[PDB]
């Protein structure tokens, strides 16, 4: 009781200090300015809801003795939130439940008491037509149930809480969704709950009847609103279709839903990456690396970014497949350095011409590549090792025996050492001829490449590109 | 020592002599502008990137 009564009594009110200022300012705003007048294309309540997801990601950790959040639920759920003269008593009810935690004891919600914390939208003239309240009054309890996820006989409490929000989601899909942004501000509440709708299901449940419900969700999308409904319903469509073998890749080629034209700078950034791997996994190399690069330089400024630990790995998988390689550790971190050393040792073998050096990696770190889920692209680098090597040898040696190149590439056979060189010319790596009767492979010396048209093609790509950024500097300037 | 330029042969001693002032003025005096302009965009960070 002294170790309790000095360390337990400040966890109730100082969260009550900041929760009368963040979602009470959201409840004070997004009931009267999302159901109210307007929250326009330049709104604040979405970014305010962006402020009330991230703060509560790392806010709550403990099972909430002293009712420091276990008493917030009997506070924050007895809410009509209809109009100002009936919420002037509710502005007292933000303080009337504070002494319920203090003078008395509330109901400590420890893994059992969430069932009398969900049935309240009948109590004291509550509604569901005001879904700028009730979609947020879903998400204000729907987040902290599932934020820790706590995975011990809880899943049904998360489910029935989603079912009441799914009842709000059907009223979203059918009933009066126009110019109140009832779809728009709840497409985020659709999108943000889907990740809590998935990590429940990616932990212990199925995946696929939600997909047909997501097709029914994609049905009404772009069918009433063409803003942030075309965007988040397609990355959340793709998120396990890539990991499954179902159709979902040539469908997304001819699909019209490729461009929502705006997706709020962070869901748009990874959007070019989930379809960036689709061209990577189905052999479309050169088209992929520009939507892989564009999916990199549109991401914000966080540090614990473990998906960015994957895109920097994957972006130069396909560039090893094309030949080009940048320095990958050019932004090396204390958390990037350990995530590069098996994969950086791979491209060490690629810039060399050795053949079973590839085999000395693929037995040492063959298990690591299957953890990242990338092995099926790794296995085909032996075509690109041998074309790197045959370009390397033909440029160095001019008149080399074909019964010498195989011993240097440890090919163990001169009789197909002619044959890779045949496919080197069929692909077009080296030009010159082979004296198959003698055995030497002669190469012609290069000639005046300066007086060829091809450096103008190095220019014309970049003349037209540099006039574009001068035009974009004009088009983005005179907003005043 | 580049006081004279040419080539020497080893088999029979043939000195193929050639000359051209190739070009120097056009490219490298336009190349150093690029690294001057790189430092200008670097100095744009001290009035734009810090500021807005």
């Amino acid at each position: 009781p002294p170790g309790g009564g000095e360390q337990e009594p400040p966890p109730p009110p100082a969260p009550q200090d900041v929760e009368m200022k963040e979602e009470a300012a959201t409840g004070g705003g997004s009931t009267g300015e999302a159901d109210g007048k307007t929250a326009a294309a330049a709104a604040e309540h979405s970014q305010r809801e962006l402020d009330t997801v991230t703060l509560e990601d790392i806010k709550e950790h403990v099972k909430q003795l002293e009712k420091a959040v276990s008493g917030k639920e009997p506070r924050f759920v007895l809410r009509a939130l209809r109009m100002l003269p009936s919420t002037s008593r509710r502005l007292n009810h933000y303080v009337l439940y504070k002494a319920v935690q203090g003078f008395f004891t509330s109901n400590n919600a420890t893994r059992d008491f969430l069932l009398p914390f969900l049935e309240e939208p009948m109590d004291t003239e509550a509604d569901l037509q005001f879904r700028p309240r009730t979609g947020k009054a879903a998400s204000t309890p729907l987040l902290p149930e599932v934020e820790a996820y706590l995975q011990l006989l809880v899943v049904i409490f998360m489910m029935n809480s989603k079912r009441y929000k799914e009842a709000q989601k059907i009223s979203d899909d059918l009933m009066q969704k126009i110019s109140t942004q009832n779809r728009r501000a709840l497409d985020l509440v659709a999108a943000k709950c889907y990740y809590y709708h998935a990590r429940v299901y990616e932990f212990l449940d199925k995946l696929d009847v939600v997909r047909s419900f997501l097709h029914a969700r994609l049905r009404t999308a772009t069918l009433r609103h063409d803003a942030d409904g075309q965007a988040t319903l397609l990355n959340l469509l793709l998120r396990n279709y890539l990991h499954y073998s179902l159709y979902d890749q040539a469908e997304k080629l001819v699909s019209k839903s490729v461009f929502p034209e705006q997706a709020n700078n962070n869901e748009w950034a990874r959007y070019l990456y989930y379809t960036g791997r689709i061209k990577a996994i189905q052999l479309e190399y050169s088209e992929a690396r520009r939507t892989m690069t564009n999916a990199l330089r549109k991401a914000p400024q966080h540090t614990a970014v473990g998906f960015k630990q994957t895109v920097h790995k994957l972006l130069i998988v396909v560039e090893l497949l094309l030949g080009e390689i940048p320095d990958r550790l050019q932004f090396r971190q204390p958390s990037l350095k350990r995530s590069l050393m098996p994969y950086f040792l791979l491209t060490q073998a690629v810039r060399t011409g050795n053949l079973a050096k590839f085999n000395q990696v693929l037995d040492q770190f063959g298990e690591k590549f299957q953890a990242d889920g990338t092995y099926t692209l790794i296995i085909r680098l032996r075509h690109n090792v041998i074309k790197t090597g045959v370009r390397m040898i033909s440029l160095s040696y001019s008149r080399i025996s074909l019964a010498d190149i195989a011993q240097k590439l440890q090919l163990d056979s001169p009789e197909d050492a002619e044959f890779i060189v045949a496919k080197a010319i069929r692909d077009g790596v080296i030009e010159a001829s082979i004296n198959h009767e003698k055995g030497y492979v002669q190469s012609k010396e290069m000639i005046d490449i300066y007086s060829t048209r091809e450096p103008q093609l190095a220019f014309h790509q970049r003349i037209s590109f540099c006039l574009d950024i001068h035009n974009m500097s004009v088009k983005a300037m005179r907003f005043p | 020592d580049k006081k004279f330029h040419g080539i020497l042969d080893q088999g029979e001693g043939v000195l193929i002599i050639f000359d051209e002032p190739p070009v120097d003025k056009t490219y490298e005096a336009a190349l150093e502008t690029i690294q001057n302009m790189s430092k200008v965009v670097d100095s744009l960070y001290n009035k734009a990137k810090k500021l807005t």
Binding site: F459, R462, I463, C466, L467, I469, H470, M472, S473, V474, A476, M477, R478, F479, P480 | A30, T33, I34, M37, V40, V41, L44, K47, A48, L51, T52
Partner: peptide, 30 residues
């Protein structure tokens, strides 16, 4: 190619010259 490269940087320095006159007056004037 050099001269067009300069054209992009100059208008970008002009872009900050409008972002200095956009943000630093909405709090001042209103």
């Amino acid at each position: 190619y050099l001269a067009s490269l300069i054209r992009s940087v100059v208008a970008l320095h002009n872009l900050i010259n409008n972002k200095i006159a956009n943000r630093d007056a909405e709090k001042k004037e209103g």
